[PDB]
Structures are given as C-alpha cells and as structure tokens.
Design a protein around this ligand. Sequence first.
Ligand SMILES: Nc1nc2c(ncn2[C@@H]2O[C@H](COP(=O)(O)OP(=O)(O)NP(=O)(O)O)[C@@H](O)[C@H]2O)c(=O)[nH]1
Ligand SMILES: [Mg+2]
Lengths: 208, 129
Amino acid sequence: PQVQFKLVLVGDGGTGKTTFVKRHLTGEFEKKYVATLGVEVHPLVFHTNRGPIKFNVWDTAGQEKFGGLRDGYYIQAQCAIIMFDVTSRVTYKNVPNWHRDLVRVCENIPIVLCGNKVDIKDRKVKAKSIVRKKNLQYYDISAKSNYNFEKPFLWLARKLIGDPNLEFVAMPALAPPEVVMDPALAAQYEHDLEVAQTTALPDEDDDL
Amino acid sequence: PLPDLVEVSSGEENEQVVFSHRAKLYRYDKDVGQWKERGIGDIKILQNYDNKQVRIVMRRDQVLKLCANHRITPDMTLQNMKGTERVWLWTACDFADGERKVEHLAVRFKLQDVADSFKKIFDEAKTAQ
Ligand SMILES: Nc1nc2c(ncn2[C@@H]2O[C@H](COP(=O)(O)OP(=O)(O)NP(=O)(O)O)[C@@H](O)[C@H]2O)c(=O)[nH]1
Ligand SMILES: [Mg+2]
C-alpha cells in the first residue's frame, strides 16, 4: 500500500493554482487563464529517500460563482496550499479568508502559503510583510521560472512524514524498449514532425 | 510508518555518460497543435558498456522526475527548426511516463558549441551501436 495525502489547493482566480499543478504534472507552462470549475483532482507522485509519496491535489475554484461545494472539498484534507499573486494585493488580502475557511474544516493541518509570479518585476506584496506559525510556512514561487516550485511539496512531505531530512531523489530510469516501426508508419511520424517544425516554441521570446 | 530509508537506483549503473549538459525540452501536442515545455535539466546521452546500446535520459530540476527516456537508433536523425537556432528536433518512442508514447521532441541549448556537440555525439553514438 502506497502513502497518499489529500492536499487541497485554494486561492483567488488567476493566482496560478492550476498553472502550478500542470507544471508539476507535465512540465508545461499554461499561459491562458481557464477558470477552474468546482474541483479537479490530480495525483502528484514524488520519489523521496524514504520511498515514493503521492499527493492527491484537489485543485479548487477561486471564483465564488464557480466554487461548487468548496468547503466540502476540504473534508478529510491532510494538508493544503494557499496561493496568491504578489503583483495583486487583493489576492493577498483574501489569504486570511482562505486560511479561515480551511481551518474551520481541517483544524491543525500543515498549510503552505505561496506568493506566486515573483518573476514579474512590479511586485506589490513583499515577503517582509508576511514574515510565523509552526503549521504555517511561506515560499516565494514562480510557476513560470519554476523558482521554489518544489518547496511546497517538499515541506509538506517533511511535516506529514515527520522527517526534516526527507529529500526528493532522482526517479529511476529503467531501460527503455527499442520500438521498430514499418517504414510506412515511420514516414507518417516524419511528416507530422515536419508539420510541427513550422510552429514555434512557446518561450521563444522569453528571458531564457 | 515509512521505510526509514530507501536506496535509489538510477538505472544508469551499467551505462556511460557520453553527453550531459543543461537544456530545455519541449513536446508537441497534436491535439492543440502547439509545442509545450516538457522539462529543464541535464539531458544525457547514455551508452551501455556491454551491448553498446544508446538512449537519451533527462530529469527535471528540483522535482528530479523524468521528462525523457527513449532509445536512439541509427535510423533516427536530428532536424533543425528553420526559424530557430541551437535547437534540435526529433521523433522518439518515449517512456518517461512509464508508457510508450510517440513524441515529437525539441531541445534548446544556450550555446552553439553545446548544440553542435549534442548533434555530434548523437550521430556518433547511434552508429556505434
Ligand atoms: N508571469 C507569470 N504568470 C503566471 C505564473 N503562474 C501562473 N501564471 C499565469 O497566471 C494565470 C493563472 O491561471 P490559473 O492557474 O488557471 O488560475 P487559478 O489559480 O487556477 N484560478 P482559478 O481558481 O479560477 O481556477 C495564467 O494566465 C498563467 O499563465 C507565474 O509564476 N508567472
Ligand atoms: Mg484553476
């Protein structure tokens, strides 16, 4: 039996909750804001030096009209992440409300507060005005630059397991099979690659 | 209760690293017709000592998860992206997600001599098999 943990992800719209989870899932960076409806549950597995641990992330909706049954999604939650946008003070002003709603249901669960979009230079919320609970923890993160994007899961893992020296470790890379295709199907993928070669890469004009 | 410690086996113990450098990997999504960022980390060309077989392996920074694990065959070739430089495209049968997925991949390098070095080692190793 594997070790699982229910993690609820809350925060205002456009803060980057879904972008963050997708980054962890596929390594992609979603540029569009596609508002989450109700909740979406995504499993995240991390390999640690104390074995693999799975996070069942309940990605909740931040807009009230799309909220569905939010407070119900917190039931039986074992940890949580609250996110906001450091370029938007309103998203930080509502952090105490998200924290309140969470504790009302889950009481003393470990929670991580994440100030996202620190890659944007016109920062309005400074980390000094945040920094102190034992179950609270703060990280600057950036889903776009990946800055500290592993720390919320690493800290939560350490707390839930009770091991301050828990480390993420390299994922085993088992020997891959060589796949042989008929020259016909190889050509069909060679054509598809040609078509793809006409579309540009998403970060072509970023800092890089 | 959790195993007090777990020894990690990379699966690369019987292989030689003939290339290793930091890079950015992209994967094309046929459904939406876009390239998507796939990972950032050290992309590695590995050759097995005994059977001389070659594969590409890549793990992502910080999370340390795989974003590439696929064999290189003598038939495979690296294409250039017309409008972009220091970037190599190729098609592979990847198992990073523990499943066979045919994927059109692109790798981006900061420096040209690293890209040229990656093309050189790619073509040497695939034929040496
Ligand atoms: N510059 C920058 N943009 C980011 C960053 N993280 C996310 N974004 C962008 O900000 C938006 C966040 O969208 P999304 O994650 O869908 O919002 P959400 O937090 O899930 N909101 P909701 O609760 O409505 O579903 C997207 O446009 C995404 O590209 C970041 O670190 N930097
Ligand atoms: Mg969302």
